[PDB]
Ligand binder design. Structure first.
Ligand SMILES: [Cl-]
Ligand SMILES: [Cl-]
Length: 447
């Protein structure tokens, strides 16, 4: 029986990175503490889950991880400890200042579990009074019900200074190493392939005047991820982009979020957007967003399709393209804050199409990676506390909403998103990881 596939050298590298950084997080925690209950596929981007994905490339439910000076402690099931066991010997070599311990808990014995919880809490206390945790994280289940009161009691008794480490974590894993950059490329290639399918399906549905809602059409695209025939078609392209020594594996392909299709006269350009249960409207502007996730690495692509567009629709789409090229080539530079980047975008728009400024989205996207949307790295005027770094990957996403076509008086919107990697190398321009066509001639259809 084959064990779970985990890269322990990467685990060791990343644990040692975290350890080299965490005392310098805001508020200087003596210890880090991560507790993960039951998994939820419908809320997959909590910091503790992201930590598991970054460390092990798998989420481990019902598992505690603590970092204290000189020690990582993992409390988990006997089956889960079996996945991890070989990692013990790796930390023994004279280089590392850290040992790894795996403490085996059991679903069916609350007294063993409580005692293990007691023991880890005592070690944390021995390290000091400041305990760093992802404060926003919420998990359910039996493990959590055993943990929560034991932790609550400890904070009081030990007078722990419990602090949020969400910003520190975002910073530790922000810059993508070469393998992550490759997994992002794979993710993005997937997105291109599903967008191609989407455009092909949308056209046929419009041409044939199907009875079908935006939501049913986007559900049809979503469900193709379960179609091995379709998966086999895109295999060569995605496998070609996997890093050496990390073989393409279909098991590792998922959705970042449910695909979005929008049509009609009312549009939503914010992350809150969901396909509506209205009939697909085969005229004007159609907005589609896809984001495949490969090996936990998120991507994003948004395209506008123009059906029998008016001149103003087409002309504003040309500008949308010009703006994207300006943002990526000239504005999105290492060393700049999100606020500086966003202000520079408004400046450019005010100089070229000032009338479009009130219609512009309030951000131009965000840092992307293991987390779809890092809320400490949204590209808007509010963020003046991060600098862009070489190695950062972004979802660059923006649009113009509530545009009125003059001769029809019809409302419309335009939207464009790609996933863009900033190379580690300074001589290298940003790379588009998503390369599905955005040329006006290729996204325009006439019926
Ligand atoms: Cl948004
Ligand atoms: Cl915003």
């Amino acid at each position: 029986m084959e064990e779970l596939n985990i890269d322990f050298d990467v685990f060791k590298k990343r644990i040692e990175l975290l350890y080299s950084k965490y005392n310098e997080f805001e508020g200087s925690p003596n210890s880090l503490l991560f507790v993960l209950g039951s998994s939820n596929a419908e809320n997959p981007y909590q910091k503790t889950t992201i930590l598991h994905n970054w460390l092990l490339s798998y989420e481990f439910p019902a598992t505690l991880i603590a970092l204290v000076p000189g020690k990582v402690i993992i409390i988990t099931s006997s089956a889960k400890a079996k996945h991890l066991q070989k990692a013990i010997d790796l930390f023994k070599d004279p280089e590392s200042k850290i040992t790894l311990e795996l403490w085996q808990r059991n679903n069916k014995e609350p007294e063993l579990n409580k005692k293990l919880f007691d023991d880890v809490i005592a070690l944390i206390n021995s390290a000091g009074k400041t305990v760093g945790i992802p404060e926003k994280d919420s998990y359910q289940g039996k493990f959590m019900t055993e943990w929560n009161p034991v932790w609550e009691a400890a904070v009081k008794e030990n007078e722990f200074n419990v602090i949020d480490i969400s910003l520190g974590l975002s910073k530790v894993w922000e810059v993508k190493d070469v393998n992550e950059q490759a997994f992002l490329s794979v993710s993005s290639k997937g997105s291109d392939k599903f967008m191609d399918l989407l455009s092909n399906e949308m056209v046929r549905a419009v041409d044939e005047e199907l009875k079908i809602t935006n939501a049913k059409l986007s559900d049809k695209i979503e469900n193709k991820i379960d179609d091995v025939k379709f998966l086999k078609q895109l295999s060569p392209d995605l496998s070609a982009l996997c890093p050496p020594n990390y073989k393409f594996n279909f098991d590792l392909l998922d959705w970042t979020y449910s695909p979005i299709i929008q049509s009609g006269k009312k549009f939503d350009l914010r992350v809150s957007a969901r396909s509506t249960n209205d009939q697909l409207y085969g005229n004007g502007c159609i907005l589609a967003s896809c984001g495949i996730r490969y090996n936990n690495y998120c991507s994003n692509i948004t395209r506008t399709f123009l059906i029998d567009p008016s001149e103003e629709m087409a002309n504003n789409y040309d500008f949308l393209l010009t703006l994207q090229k300006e943002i990526v080539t000239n504005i999105l530079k290492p060393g700049r804050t999100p606020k500086e980047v966003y202000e520079s975008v408004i400046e450019y728009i005010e100089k070229t199409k000032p009338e479009l400024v009130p219609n512009f989205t309030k951000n131009i996207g965000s840092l992307i990676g293991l987390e779809f949307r890092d809320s400490n790295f949204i590209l808007n005027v509010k963020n003046d506390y991060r600098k862009i770094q070489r190695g950062d990957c972004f979802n660059i996403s923006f649009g113009f909403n509530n545009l009125k076509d003059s001769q029809s008086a019809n409302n419309y919107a335009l939207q464009l998103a790609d996933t863009v990697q900033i190379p580690l190398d300074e001589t290298e321009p940003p790379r588009f990881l998503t390369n599905y066509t955005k040329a006006k001639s290729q996204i325009s259809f006439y019926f």
